[PDB]
Write a protein that binds this ligand. Sequence first.
Ligand SMILES: Nc1ncnc2c1ncn2[C@@H]1O[C@H](CSCC[C@H](N)C(=O)O)[C@@H](O)[C@H]1O
Ligand SMILES: Nc1ncnc2c1ncn2[C@@H]1O[C@H](CSCC[C@H](N)C(=O)O)[C@@H](O)[C@H]1O
Lengths: 216, 213
Amino acid sequence: GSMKIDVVTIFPEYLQPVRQSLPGKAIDAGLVDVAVHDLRRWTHDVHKSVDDSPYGGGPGMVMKPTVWGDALDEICTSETLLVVPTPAGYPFTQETAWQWSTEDHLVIACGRYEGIDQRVADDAATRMRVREVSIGDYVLNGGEAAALVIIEAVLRLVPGVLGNASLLEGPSYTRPPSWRGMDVPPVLLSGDHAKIAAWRAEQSRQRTIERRPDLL
Amino acid sequence: SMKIDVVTIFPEYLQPVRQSLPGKGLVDVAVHDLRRWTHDVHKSVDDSPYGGGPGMVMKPTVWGDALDEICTSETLLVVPTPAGYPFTQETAWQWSTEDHLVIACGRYEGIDQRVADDAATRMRVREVSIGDYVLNGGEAAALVIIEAVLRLVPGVSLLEGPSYTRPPSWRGMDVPPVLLSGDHAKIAAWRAEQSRQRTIERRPDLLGFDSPT
Ligand SMILES: Nc1ncnc2c1ncn2[C@@H]1O[C@H](CSCC[C@H](N)C(=O)O)[C@@H](O)[C@H]1O
Ligand SMILES: Nc1ncnc2c1ncn2[C@@H]1O[C@H](CSCC[C@H](N)C(=O)O)[C@@H](O)[C@H]1O
């Protein structure tokens, strides 16, 4: 219904595309508010440091717990659902999106480098609900693109926000009826709607077997 | 060297590409407004589905004209769709050595199937899903695919366990003492146990076990 989303990142301009995709009517009706915060506002030093070397050695850098702790202390409450994107997370799915779509307050903590010192999420989980999640079986450079995916999948399930209204879906067609020597399947122009439904069901079955045998 | 062209009716949503990777002289990225290839005064790129159903389908005519101009026989045409083959880390490795990616971004209920079918007669075509959830458009999927590919371009299993940095004690929470010990063998062993434990809990499928619920 009415949702606030706060995103914390060292690249706040990355999140401009979705602030723009929000219909004015939804904002004016008080249905949604998305705010983006530069993590460097909570740094301690003149060099605005957000990362440091990993304990135990190895390549890369780790984001600092003292900076992230201060940021989340200010932005979160006991009622916040804290979302931490990570390729080592639980899978984010359509079920997850439906569940989160009724939340009052999401906070998304975007990592870079090797990620965030684990004590940040572990400390937060002693006083709010925390969810570490992966958006797929690949490695991104940062959490910003993951935040864009999560925000879009969730907000399209909130009535009236983004301006929109198993087996895989089969192919779709529209005008013109013939194009570059390819005709639309004649069954779709037949006016036999029980037959059309059966044809679509079989197309779905075939596509699922070919592309996603795991779903069977 | 890689060229990536992205085609969309919302070119503005792709502004963040100025941050998708450091590689952006190793890789050039260009964004194109699909409506530039309409002749219409209304520039209508969609209509109701044959056979019925909710929503609208993007017409093949406009897509055909755009791809005719942008693609060659060497192009790998990428078409995001939740009904696609899965896009995975193996896919990103495969695409990292391509000369030319073109990403065709859908809106509404997607693109007339004849666009991909026609394209496949002159070039390689890949319909792919980035995960088991539904987006409103292909633009966010294009940003994900570009990020995953560009960090693998030349010139640039299990779940990773937790990471830590200074200070060694924070809010009464200590960094695991083994990580401070300087013993490489014990640290490597501890990190291995951590990775396997996290994988059993969060992604049992990766180790060949049933998925939860
Ligand atoms: N598949 C994915 N899903 C969600 N976030 C991802 C992601 N891949 C990368 N990220 C984001 O990008 C950041 C850097 S990648 C971090 C790599 C780390 N060694 C690890 O495996 O955990 C992550 O902290 C996360 O915010
Ligand atoms: N999981 C996902 N992976 C990749 N692209 C996706 C996606 N979810 C939505 N999209 C994009 O968003 C657009 C609208 S979703 C419409 C697709 C259609 N109803 C079907 O089921 O096949 C798609 O054309 C695709 O470009």
